[PDB]
Amino acid sequence: TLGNTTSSVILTNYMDTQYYGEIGIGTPPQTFKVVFDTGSSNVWVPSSKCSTACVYHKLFDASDSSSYKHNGTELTLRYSTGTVSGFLSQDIITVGGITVTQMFGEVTEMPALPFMLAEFDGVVGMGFIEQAIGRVTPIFDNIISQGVLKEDVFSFYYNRDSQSLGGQIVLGGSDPQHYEGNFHYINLIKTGVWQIQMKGVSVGSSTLLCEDGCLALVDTGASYISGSTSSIEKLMEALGAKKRLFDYVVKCNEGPTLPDISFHLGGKEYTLTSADYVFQESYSSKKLCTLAIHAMDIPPPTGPTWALGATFIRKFYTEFDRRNNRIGFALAR
Numbered sequence: 001t002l003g004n005t006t007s008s009v010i011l012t013n014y015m016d017t018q019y020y021g022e023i024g025i026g027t028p029p030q031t032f033k034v035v036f037d038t039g040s041s042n043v044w045v046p047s048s049k050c051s052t053a054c055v056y057h058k059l060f061d062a063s064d065s066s067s068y069k070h071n072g073t074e075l076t077l078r079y080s081t082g083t084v085s086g087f088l089s090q091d092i093i094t095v096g097g098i099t100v101t102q103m104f105g106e107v108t109e110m111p112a113l114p115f116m117l118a119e120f121d122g123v124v125g126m127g128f129i130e131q132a133i134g135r136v137t138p139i140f141d142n143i144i145s146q147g148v149l150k151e152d153v154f155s156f157y158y159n160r161d162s163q164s165l166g167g168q169i170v171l172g173g174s175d176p177q178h179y180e181g182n183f184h185y186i187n188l189i190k191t192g193v194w195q196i197q198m199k200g201v202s203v204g205s206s207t208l209l210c211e212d213g214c215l216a217l218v219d220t221g222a223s224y225i226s227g228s229t230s231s232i233e234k235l236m237e238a239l240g241a242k243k244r245l246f247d248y249v250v251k252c253n254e255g256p257t258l259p260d261i262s263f264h265l266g267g268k269e270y271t272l273t274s275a276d277y278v279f280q281e282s283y284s285s286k287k288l289c290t291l292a293i294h295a296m297d298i299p300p301p302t303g304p305t306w307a308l309g310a311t312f313i314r315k316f317y318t319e320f321d322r323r324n325n326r327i328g329f330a331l332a333r
């Protein structure tokens with residue numbers, strides 16, 4: 001029918017690392033907490049057929065759904081900690097009011113890491129079919145198909161942690177209340193991945209990395225800003241940060257004095273100040289403070305690349321444009 005629709009999905013912000021909203025699967029709807037991930041293209045939730053990370057999440061019960069259509073084809077999703085395994089199923093999925101018949105994964109095996117830490121149940125991949133495992137049609141392609149959206153775009157707002165809004169996803173447009181000024185666009189290197197060309201990473205007023213150009217994946221599913229092990233070893237050396245097992249730290253008192261970090265994308269320099277990347281949990285010289293920048297070695301074909309996750313998105317309201325194959329950034333509000 002008439003496409004003037006702009007569906008808003010409200011997100012919960014858990015500790016500035018997990019941003020999740022709800023979806024409803026089946027007849028009647030079974031609700032799930034999901035992360036909306038531009039870095040992946042498959043929809044998956046835990047199955048009732050799950051034996052132990054599962055135990056801790058909401059399980060989908062096909063036997064309680066009148067709209068369910070069996071499939072059973074094996075689904076295997078590679079994560080950096082191991083495999084998320086299950087089988088395909090088809091059901092009616094509700095997201096921000098829009099209902100679509102979707103092929104999704106009913107997960108029967110999850111690695112304990114990171115899933116034991118997850119406040120959310122499953123994943124809703126906002127990526128392209130080119131990266132969908134089993135060539136399964138992604139949710140956004142199916143929403144596009146309905147011809148309901150105002151524009152063939154979706155936007156992300158991630159807040160900084162009080163009864164305030166954790167985040168928001170607008171399907172069919174952007175929310176001007178959550179951004180200031182106008183959007184600056186960067187075309188995708190190629191369709192099939194939410195990845196753009198990056199022309200430099202600067203510490204202060206000097207380009208220290210990516211001087212000859214590199215790739216930047218705009219990943220809403222990633223908690224932090226990430227680079228390859230070698231890029232982050234060099235960047236952390238420049239910042240004077242020290243490696244620990246899972247992160248890099250600075251003495252808490254040294255944190256507010258850390259230089260600005262800039263990402264050269266399109267015609268602009270996108271700047272993050274120390275307040276945007278330091279988890280300032282204290283101001284003590286006797287305590288250590290974590291950085292919201294990590295090393296993540298993304299495997300080919302997508303990698304090696306940088307990934308602009310929640311750390312970048314909190315600063316810059318992001319619009320994913322499928323009609324035009326571009327990403328737009330505006331300063332978040």
Ligand SMILES: Clc1ccc(N(C[C@@H]2CNC[C@H]2Cc2ccccc2)c2ccccc2)cc1
Pocket residue numbers: 035037038039040114123219220221222223224298299302
């Ligand atoms: Cl810190 C952190 C690091 C990773 C995540 N992820 C996985 C990343 C989010 N998008 C896909 C993947 C990166 C990738 C992109 C392209 C190709 C390969 C990998 C996650 C997301 C949701 C649930 C569980 C994990 C989250 C936080």
Ligand SMILES: Clc1ccc(N(C[C@@H]2CNC[C@H]2Cc2ccccc2)c2ccccc2)cc1
Pocket residue numbers: 017018079080081113114115117118119223246
């Ligand atoms: Cl692929 C992948 C995704 C996340 C991790 N994580 C957990 C993430 C790192 N700190 C925030 C947390 C958010 C999260 C929690 C659950 C799911 C997604 C993000 C991890 C890092 C070091 C030690 C243990 C866990 C690891 C691999």
Ligand SMILES: *[C@@H]1O[C@H](CO)[C@@H](O)[C@H](O)[C@H]1NC(C)=O
Pocket residue numbers: 070071072073088
């Ligand atoms: C499952 O879905 C795939 C989608 O390509 C289809 O080819 C296959 O025949 C389906 N299997 C069953 C048993 O429905």
